[PDB]
Design a protein around this ligand. Structure first.
Ligand SMILES: *C(=O)N1C[C@H](NOS(=O)(=O)O)CC[C@H]1C(N)=O
Ligand SMILES: [Cl-]
Length: 261
């Protein structure tokens, strides 16, 4: 009751729509809030795309070293790493790291293209047992986050279950799983989101995202000090097309659902 009331109060205060799913692997419990509603994933979808490449690599060992041309024509709205490599190549490993750790949207597009496009990323999700996830579009349009639009959405429950599988479970081979985890732990973009609601000593691997309608998201694997890990999805979106980011709402949600652990 208490956690639910606190999340409803946070949602009310925020003015928007909040989705939370926490999986606590200590006792196999969950904390859920709007966990079966759809939310635009925005850049949190990059985890699935990187995982698809990692899966592909299991049957093509030299895949991560494969070189990909970066051209001016590849540039999109947010190219912090790719802009440095125009007219050269990046490896699929470098593209994965750039997508996950700097949220480079060119890098995401290369991951998407490599595996066959959004419908291939979606088919991968289905193969894992995630029947909720849908990647419809490429970057940058996948971030529009229009209310009522199912494109490029998932639910907090599904994404928490899938992230658990990918990082802590057996979706990926041991080398590939370790690589995903290392990439996520090295994320540079998440300090203001879930991490901001957790004690400083906890270790986090996360992937943030943002989009239209003030959409502000984060998904994380969390290793509390001397505890079994957690998986947390916090998705948030707002009524106004040009609403401001609210990373603080994600931090507040994280604090509410972890208080006491
Ligand atoms: C992902 O949501 N996109 C790419 C980039 N992500 O950075 S974030 O994860 O720190 O939000 C910027 C926002 C967004 C986009 N609109 O392209
Ligand atoms: Cl602290």
């Amino acid at each position: 009751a208490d956690v639910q009331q606190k999340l409803a109060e946070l949602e009310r205060q925020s003015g928007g729509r909040l989705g939370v799913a926490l999986i606590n692997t200590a006792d196999n419990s969950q904390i859920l809030y709007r966990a079966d509603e759809r939310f635009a994933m925005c850049s949190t979808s990059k985890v699935m795309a990187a995982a698809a490449v990692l899966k592909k690599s299991e049957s093509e060992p030299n895949l991560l070293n494969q070189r990909v041309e970066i051209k001016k024509s590849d540039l999109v709205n947010y190219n912090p790493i790719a802009e440095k490599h125009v007219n050269g190549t990046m490896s699929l490993a470098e593209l994965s790291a750039a997508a996950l750790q700097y949220s480079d949207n060119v890098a995401m597009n290369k991951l998407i293209a490599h595996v066959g496009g959004p419908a291939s990323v979606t088919a991968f999700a289905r193969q894992l047992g995630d029947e909720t996830f849908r990647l419809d579009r490429t970057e940058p349009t996948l971030n529009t986050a229009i209310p009522g639009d199912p494109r490029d959405t998932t639910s907090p429950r599904a994404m928490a279950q899938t992230l658990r599988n990918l990082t802590l479970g057996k979706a990926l081979g041991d080398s590939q799983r370790a690589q995903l985890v290392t990439w996520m732990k090295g994320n540079t973009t998440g300090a203001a989101s879930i991490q901001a609601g957790l004690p400083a000593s906890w270790v986090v691997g996360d992937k943030t995202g943002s989009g239209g309608y003030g959409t502000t998201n984060d998904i994380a694997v969390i290793w509390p000090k001397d505890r079994a890990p957690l998986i947390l999805v916090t998705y948030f979106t707002q009524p106004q097309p040009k609403a401001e980011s609210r990373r603080d709402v994600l931090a507040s949600a994280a604090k509410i659902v972890t208080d006491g652990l």
